[PDB]
Design an enzyme around this catalytic site. Structure first.
Site, mmCIF file in Angstrom:
data_model
loop_
_atom_site.group_PDB
_atom_site.id
_atom_site.type_symbol
_atom_site.label_atom_id
_atom_site.label_comp_id
_atom_site.label_asym_id
_atom_site.label_seq_id
_atom_site.Cartn_x
_atom_site.Cartn_y
_atom_site.Cartn_z
ATOM 1 N N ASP A 66 11.386 58.839 -37.847
ATOM 2 C CA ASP A 66 11.423 57.814 -38.886
ATOM 3 C C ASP A 66 11.567 56.489 -38.144
ATOM 4 O O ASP A 66 11.838 56.479 -36.940
ATOM 5 C CB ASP A 66 12.594 58.028 -39.859
ATOM 6 C CG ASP A 66 13.921 58.248 -39.153
ATOM 7 O OD1 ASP A 66 14.172 57.600 -38.116
ATOM 8 O OD2 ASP A 66 14.724 59.066 -39.653
ATOM 9 N N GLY B 186 13.842 54.276 -38.516
ATOM 10 C CA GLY B 186 15.234 53.934 -38.293
ATOM 11 C C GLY B 186 15.732 52.813 -39.187
ATOM 12 O O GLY B 186 16.926 52.520 -39.211
ATOM 13 N N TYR C 288 15.719 52.715 -42.525
ATOM 14 C CA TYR C 288 16.382 53.233 -43.718
ATOM 15 C C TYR C 288 17.880 53.415 -43.517
ATOM 16 O O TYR C 288 18.687 52.850 -44.255
ATOM 17 C CB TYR C 288 15.752 54.569 -44.120
ATOM 18 C CG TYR C 288 14.337 54.450 -44.643
ATOM 19 C CD1 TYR C 288 13.482 53.448 -44.181
ATOM 20 C CD2 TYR C 288 13.844 55.350 -45.584
ATOM 21 C CE1 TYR C 288 12.179 53.346 -44.643
ATOM 22 C CE2 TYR C 288 12.536 55.258 -46.051
ATOM 23 C CZ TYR C 288 11.709 54.252 -45.576
ATOM 24 O OH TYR C 288 10.415 54.153 -46.032
ATOM 25 N N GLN D 147 4.641 51.745 -50.648
ATOM 26 C CA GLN D 147 5.838 51.355 -51.384
ATOM 27 C C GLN D 147 5.375 50.848 -52.747
ATOM 28 O O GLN D 147 4.215 51.035 -53.114
ATOM 29 C CB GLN D 147 6.618 50.268 -50.630
ATOM 30 C CG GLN D 147 7.331 50.760 -49.363
ATOM 31 C CD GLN D 147 8.382 51.836 -49.642
ATOM 32 O OE1 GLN D 147 8.830 52.008 -50.773
ATOM 33 N NE2 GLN D 147 8.787 52.552 -48.598
ATOM 34 N N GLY E 102 9.878 55.564 -50.898
ATOM 35 C CA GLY E 102 10.664 55.124 -52.035
ATOM 36 C C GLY E 102 10.817 56.065 -53.215
ATOM 37 O O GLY E 102 11.129 55.604 -54.310
ATOM 38 N N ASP F 84 10.090 66.599 -45.840
ATOM 39 C CA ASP F 84 11.283 66.634 -45.007
ATOM 40 C C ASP F 84 12.476 66.340 -45.906
ATOM 41 O O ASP F 84 12.332 65.699 -46.948
ATOM 42 C CB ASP F 84 11.240 65.576 -43.899
ATOM 43 C CG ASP F 84 11.696 64.204 -44.381
ATOM 44 O OD1 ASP F 84 10.846 63.409 -44.824
ATOM 45 O OD2 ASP F 84 12.914 63.929 -44.331
ATOM 46 N N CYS G 140 13.867 87.837 -48.662
ATOM 47 C CA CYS G 140 13.808 87.048 -47.440
ATOM 48 C C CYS G 140 13.669 87.884 -46.170
ATOM 49 O O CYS G 140 14.379 88.874 -45.979
ATOM 50 C CB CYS G 140 15.046 86.162 -47.336
ATOM 51 S SG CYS G 140 14.982 85.035 -45.951
ATOM 52 N N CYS H 288 14.172 86.648 -43.088
ATOM 53 C CA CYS H 288 14.857 86.022 -41.965
ATOM 54 C C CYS H 288 15.845 86.966 -41.286
ATOM 55 O O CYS H 288 16.278 87.964 -41.866
ATOM 56 C CB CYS H 288 15.555 84.727 -42.407
ATOM 57 S SG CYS H 288 17.293 84.869 -42.890
ATOM 58 N N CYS I 156 19.170 87.704 -43.194
ATOM 59 C CA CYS I 156 19.110 88.662 -44.290
ATOM 60 C C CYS I 156 18.836 90.068 -43.804
ATOM 61 O O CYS I 156 19.000 91.034 -44.543
ATOM 62 C CB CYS I 156 18.045 88.245 -45.296
ATOM 63 S SG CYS I 156 18.511 86.755 -46.178
ATOM 64 N N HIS J 148 19.054 80.806 -42.556
ATOM 65 C CA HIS J 148 18.455 81.378 -43.756
ATOM 66 C C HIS J 148 17.741 80.334 -44.610
ATOM 67 O O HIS J 148 16.602 80.549 -45.022
ATOM 68 C CB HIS J 148 19.499 82.057 -44.646
ATOM 69 C CG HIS J 148 19.017 82.270 -46.047
ATOM 70 N ND1 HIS J 148 18.069 83.218 -46.369
ATOM 71 C CD2 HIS J 148 19.249 81.572 -47.183
ATOM 72 C CE1 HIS J 148 17.734 83.091 -47.640
ATOM 73 N NE2 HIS J 148 18.434 82.097 -48.157
HETATM 74 ZN ZN LIG Z 1 17.257 84.990 -45.276
#
Ligand SMILES: [Zn+2]
Ligand SMILES: [Zn+2]
Lengths: 363, 363
Positions: B92, B94, B96, B184, B211, B261, B299, B301, B304, B330
């Site tokens: 970014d 910076g 903000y 913007q 914004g 993000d 899930c 992952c 899990c 997770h």
């Molecule tokens: Zn998971």
């Protein structure tokens, strides 16, 4: 594998190296056990703990009996399943932390209220699914008068007998787990001898040397170990509870100790202290702000393979969790590497030389 | 690979799925970028971030320019080497966090003192070794009067031109990194149009919709995206900054967004909130104390696959670091799985159905 089988493969002076075979795995000795407080070795996944070389971990009982609870963990399938560590786990009796983390404590011959008794302690460790159960005793305060040291030791020996019987009365536990008795007696040789004889008479799978992680200073600890370890049965493991500074470990092994545990690696790791063969360093110090070298120049851990002191310095000073994770992994790996060097040097009959070389550089 | 190449492989309505090829790697779109604050995705090693499926991460600049410092990171080899992430990184500007984490801020046409200017911002991102550089602008406060929204937008467009020239004047940066401009204009269609035209006139590798992560409510955000995204060049990536709630992401993709993000996955993870296909849950709630099921039933992952809600419940309530590590892994994996389902459904022309099914269950 058998329930319990300790075999000594090599010796040098009082030092020994071998293995302890148990149902959940083999433990290479001398061994260092990372400490798991509250069902977790702080900041590390169990696979990471294993990756560092650990064969067994220590599970603190005091915390677990309160949160989440012994019966609950049992209902959930046991500590191993709960935290995801399928190898051996040694559990303390929980009596120590009671006299340190609780209040309005009331001690009696029956046990301690804050009602944790020898019988309940053994049962809690059973519910947790402990592989190596510690007898419930009293860690004599330091310093202690001969009278007080004797009273505590005598009580602990009576509790050792109660722990043994409680453990044996539970078929499943007696057949799958092991029981260690604890030698007490403060720094007095005659008391240490009486304790050792009482424990040997009862009979245990292993013998711990208790009451020496009380800030008596290395010289005094070594002096006590000099005459204390020889009193214990030679063919059973010798466990020095709560001892872990690198130099302390080397000296204890030189005196006959086979097992160790302590929060130093983990706790100090999170505080910014990293162990290196050239002695410990405080990664927070400004001199590491642009140091691109790894924590230790020889360390084979994943942390030293991928990150610089500069980055870890940044992480710790910023209070980042990854900082704790990395420092902890390195420190535990460093400890395991130390144990490996100790085991190999003993097996090769050059442990005394290793001890000398280690000290010269570390200091 | 080329410096930058965005290609759209499939479409459905306003939704698109494709890839962004860059020197350090390929980014699958729509993409979710985990946020790395202070050179680290909180509680996760970079390999773990990659393991969840992330192709790129966002590096916050504000923090790094202060600690450890842009010039220092450059001297140390760049952010990638520093934190151990060798794939693309979007930084970014910076600006903000300056208007949110600093004090005695003084804004002018030259930039902001707290002196971060468009030129310095671009240079800092260059020193960090950013792959995707964000133009330096002003995130208009919400709500905003048309007059104020126009003034900020107009200033941001002047700063967009300055960012472009600064980026282009640095050969190494212009040849190896990419530059995104930011639209913007608050919630006003005419301002959004003027901003889009100004940005397109200057020309950027990607266009962000700025914004809209200001608490205007999902309905309003969607309404603004409805007319705002179509104004941006169709053949370039569309990045919705700071947006991340699962349902927000699905709706934004339905409206033409390619990149996202937000700290929700990480921050909420450490606070006890776990995302599941049946909606988020607060693992700290007593109802999970003995729940042996994994965080989410589907899930894939590692968390899990190995640990129960009961264990993670215990960890978080005990303030254990492993708790943060597990919840975070997770949640980020959940987000990546969401993006994967989105990409596949679009490629298969059944994204609209997926959106409907997702919402029905999630709510
Ligand atoms: Zn998971
Ligand atoms: Zn290391």
């Amino acid at each position: 594998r058998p329930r319990f089988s300790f075999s000594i493969a090599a010796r040098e002076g009082k030092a020994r190296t071998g293995t302890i075979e148990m149902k959940r795995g083999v433990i290479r000795t001398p061994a260092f056990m990372p400490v798991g407080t509250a069902a977790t070795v702080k900041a590390l996944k169990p696979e990471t703990v294993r990756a560092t070389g650990a064969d067994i971990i220590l599970g603190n009982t005091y915390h677990l009996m309160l949160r989440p609870g012994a019966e609950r963990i049992a209902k959930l399938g046991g500590l191993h399943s709960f935290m995801g560590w399928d190898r051996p786990i040694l559990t303390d009796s929980g009596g120590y932390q009671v006299m340190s983390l609780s209040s309005l404590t009331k001690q009696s011959e029956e046990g301690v209220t804050f009602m944790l008794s020898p019988e309940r302690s053994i049962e809690i460790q059973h519910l947790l699914g402990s592989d190596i159960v510690m007898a419930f005793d009293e860690c004599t305060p330091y310093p202690a008068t001969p009278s007080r040291a004797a009273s505590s030791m005598e009580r602990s020996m009576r509790w050792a007998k109660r722990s043994r019987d409680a453990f044996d009365s539970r078929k499943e536990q007696a057949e799958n787990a092991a029981l260690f008795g604890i030698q007490q007696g403060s720094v007095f040789e005659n008391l240490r001898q009486q304790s050792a004889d009482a424990l040997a008479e009862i009979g245990f799978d292993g013998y711990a040397v208790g009451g020496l992680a009380v800030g008596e200073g290395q010289d005094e600890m070594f002096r006590v170990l000099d005459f204390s370890v020889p009193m214990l049965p030679d063919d059973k493991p010798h466990y020095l509870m709560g001892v872990g500074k690198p130099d302390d470990i080397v000296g204890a092994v030189e005196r006959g100790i086979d097992m160790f545990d302590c929060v130093l690696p983990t706790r100090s790791g999170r505080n910014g202290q990293a162990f290196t063969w050239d002695g410990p360093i405080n990664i927070r110090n400004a001199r590491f702000s642009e140091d691109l070298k790894p924590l230790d120049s020889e360390c084979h851990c994943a942390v030293c393979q991928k990150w610089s002191r500069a980055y870890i310095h940044h992480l710790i000073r910023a209070g980042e969790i990854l900082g704790a994770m990395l420092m902890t992994e390195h420190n535990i790996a460093f400890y395991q590497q130390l144990m490996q060097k100790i085991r190999d040097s003993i097996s090769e009959g050059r442990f005394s030389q290793f001890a000398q070389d280690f000290r010269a550089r570390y200091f």
